[PDB]
Amino acid sequence: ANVPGQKVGTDQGKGKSGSDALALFLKVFAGEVLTAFTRRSVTADKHIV
């Protein structure tokens, strides 16, 4: 059957639920920022200035 081993991500404290197996790991920053798309003008050079 299965192999006995360690549970490094499960929380097995006193009086604490252990139904999640990824509770002690952290969330990290990806490395890219989603900025809005740029806008451009069209009438800059089509009249008298």
Binding site: Q12, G13, K14, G15, K16
Partner: protein
């Protein structure tokens, strides 16, 4: 939820006595040093370093 993991240890609260029956200042140090003995012993059984 008084422990981190079961089988490691809890905290200790010790009573000294009534307040109206310790008028003399030297009648309070006796109780204090008489209750510090149990506090000394309850910290060693949890393997707390000295």
């Amino acid at each position: 939820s008084n422990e981190n993991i079961a089988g490691l240890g809890t905290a200790s609260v010790l009573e000294v006595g009534k307040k109206a029956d310790l008028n003399t200042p030297a009648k309070l140090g006796e109780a204090i040093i008489g209750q510090l003995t149990i506090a000394r012993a309850k910290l060693t059984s949890n393997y707390v370093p000295a």
